[PDB]
């Protein structure tokens, strides 16, 4: 029951209370492990570091021929201090960032997005009350809806659910529909608040003899809680990321048992 | 409220003043304001049979239009004619935000998922067992190497993660659902007694609200609160979450940032402009108000 609709036939008070809200895909966590042990440094650096441990072994086995050895032990201590300090820095980077980002957003934040894609059911009431906007956030959202020309005005509502659940293309649907296709498939997420308002509801004819009595009974079912009961009835319904290291541990244990075989044989 | 003396059309400001100004602008009316006689928003004075207050005055046809926070209830519209709603209010839950130090003897070993620390202790035992099995050298050197790497990667990771907790302060702690403040009992699901929310939690029949009625009526002298400001007090000091009206919840929850909303509107009701029963200006103001909400000016206001 909206403005130009109000003029012809007379609508009652509102049945439910609508809203224009964003249905987005839930963020699918992050990239998981395991073997996120060496994740913070570049792979070639870990390779050349293992080569450097071999180099230190070569330096000591050539020192098998003591202060001259003491100074190369000093350089080695300097080197592992810097490399494990830099390791803790980069892993601090990846965890502070991957906890730093606000995955959910506000409405103007959804306007400021890059990987998200706004849009409504193509050329309709959602496109209307985002079309004739005056709020500059919503205005710029209409600008981007007309601007990112590829597929922003997606056509169908089920296809709206398709563009939401498939790719990072958020739909901007009416809040009742966001309720139905949100609590019908729990992968979605209700981004934002309620960007507008409107009240859907029973509308009787042009000034007719039944706006009064019907709206009276509609409020009577609205405050004796039966409408909410009907609403709920027919509508409603780190860790192993570092795991790898334990695998390296077992692996080295097994390599050491092979070293044990070697030693017992030598005996 | 300002310094200089004034009256009448200058005497009031805020939300409903701006609503009346825009409504009489697009309507072309003369906004002769008047404060209420009895002061109360008013109700059907059920003992004396009449309505009281603003409902009495519009029932007496004294003023033309009632433009205020009045709420179009199913008893109330049986004596007036109210429009479609200005805003859409509801009962909602106000609780303290996550306060801060949620410490404990777990906060040392906090930033690792506790299964990893358990398996870490397991691996310490196991590597020591393998060292005991080494007593049948390069075996010793290599087990020292691998075990050193292992605690290096643990302690470096734990440092990084504790860094991420001391710069990401995403608390998100307390119970946030109507059923959540229902089912637990360490929170105190309190309310403002003898009013709106007392009724719509009392008279209803939804299940979550039924248990809410139970936890209300159990501690009725203890957990029920007198004034809306008293509810602001009980949610400031103790863990007495209040169940108050949505407009007041917003207008406090952008005032003193320690209090905060939890969950959406439990129920709904419609506040907004209404008039004497049979007033021909009613549907006119209705078309105006729907145009204003379509204008964005209502949301702007």
């Amino acid at each position: 029951i909206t403005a130009e609709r109000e003029k012809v036939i007379d609508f009652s008070k509102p049945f439910m209370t609508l809203g224009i809200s964003i249905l987005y895909r839930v963020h699918m966590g992050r990239k998981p492990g395991y073997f996120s042990f060496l994740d913070p440094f570049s792979p070639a650096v870990w390779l050349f570091m293992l080569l450097a441990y071999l180099a230190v072994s070569v330096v000591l086995f050539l020192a098998a021929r003591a202060l001259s050895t003491r100074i190369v032990s000093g350089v080695w201590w300097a080197f592992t201090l810097i490399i494990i300090s830099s390791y803790t820095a980069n892993l601090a980077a990846f965890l502070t960032v991957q906890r730093m980002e606000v995955p959910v957003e506000s409405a103007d934040d959804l306007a400021d997005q890059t990987n998200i894609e706004y849009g409504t059911i193509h050329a309709g009431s959602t496109m209307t009350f985002f079309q004739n906007s005056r709020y500059q956030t919503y205005q710029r959202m209409w600008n981007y809806m007309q601007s990112k020309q590829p597929s922003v005005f997606v056509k169908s509502t089920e296809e709206g659910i398709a563009r939401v659940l498939n790719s990072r293309y958020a739909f901007l649907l009416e809040s009742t529909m966001n309720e139905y296709h949100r609590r019908l498939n729990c992968n979605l997420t209700q981004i934002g608040g309620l960007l507008d308002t409107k009240g859907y509801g029973i509308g009787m004819p042009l000034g007719s003899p039944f706006r009064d009595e019907i709206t009276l009974a509609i409020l009577q079912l609205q405050e004796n809680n039966r409408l909410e009961i009907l609403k709920r009835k027919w509508w409603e319904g780190g860790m192993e990321n570092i795991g790898g290291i334990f695998v390296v541990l077992i692996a080295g244990l097994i390599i050491a048992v092979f070293v044990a075989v070697m030693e017992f044989i030598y005996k | 409220k300002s310094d200089k003396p004034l009256y009448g059309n200058d005497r009031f400001e805020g939300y409903c003043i701006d609503l009346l100004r825009e409504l009489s602008t697009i309507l072309g009316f003369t906004y002769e304001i008047r404060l209420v006689e009895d002061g109360k928003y008013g109700a059907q004075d059920d003992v004396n049979g009449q309505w009281n207050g603003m409902v009495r005055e519009l029932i007496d046809h004294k003023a033309d239009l009632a433009v205020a926070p009045l709420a179009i209830t199913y008893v109330r519209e049986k004596v007036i004619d109210f429009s479609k709603p200005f805003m859409t209010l509801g009962i909602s839950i106000l609780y303290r935000k996550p306060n801060g130090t949620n410490p404990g003897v777990f906060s040392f070993l906090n930033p690792l998922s506790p299964d990893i620390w358990m398996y870490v202790l397991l691996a310490y035992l196991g590597v020591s067992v393998v060292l005991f099995v080494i007593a049948r050298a390069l075996s010793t050197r290599i087990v020292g190497g691998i075990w050193w790497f292992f605690t290096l990667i643990i302690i470096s990771s734990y440092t990084a993660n504790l860094a991420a907790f001391l710069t990401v302060e995403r608390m998100e702690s307390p119970i946030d659902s109507a059923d959540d403040l229902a089912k637990q009992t360490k929170i105190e699901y309190g309310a403002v007694e003898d009013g709106a929310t007392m009724t719509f939690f009392k008279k209803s029949k939804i299940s979550t609200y039924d248990k809410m009625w139970a936890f209300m009526s159990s501690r009725r002298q203890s957990v029920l609160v007198k004034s809306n400001e008293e509810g602001i007090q009980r949610v400031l000091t103790s863990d007495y979450a209040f169940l108050m009206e949505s407009t007041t919840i917003e207008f406090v929850t952008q005032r003193n940032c320690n209090l905060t909303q939890i969950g959406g509107l439990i129920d709904s009701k419609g506040y907004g402009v209404g008039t004497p029963m049979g007033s021909p200006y009613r549907d006119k103001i209705t078309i105006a108000i729907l145009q204003l909400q379509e204008e964005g000016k209502l949301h702007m206001m």
């Binding site: 440094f41 570049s42 070639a44 650096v45 050349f48 570091m49 450097a52 180099a55 230190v56 330096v59 050539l62 020192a63 021929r65 001259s68 050895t69 100074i71 190369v72 000093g74 350089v75 080695w76 300097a78 080197f79 810097i82 490399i83 830099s86 600008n143 981007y144 601007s147 990112k148 | -």
Partner: protein, 35 residues
């Protein structure tokens, strides 16, 4: 103007070199002690 205009490994490499230099100096001083 706003509308029609406003659109939409080697890092630590260094310290690796320090370890190389140290090992060079080491070979040198060790041959020195041998002599």
């Amino acid at each position: 103007k706003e509308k029609w205009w406003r659109g939409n490994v080697q890092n630590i490499g260094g310290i690796f070199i320090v370890l190389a230099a140290g090992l060079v100096l080491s070979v040198f001083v060790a041959v020195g002690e041998f002599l």
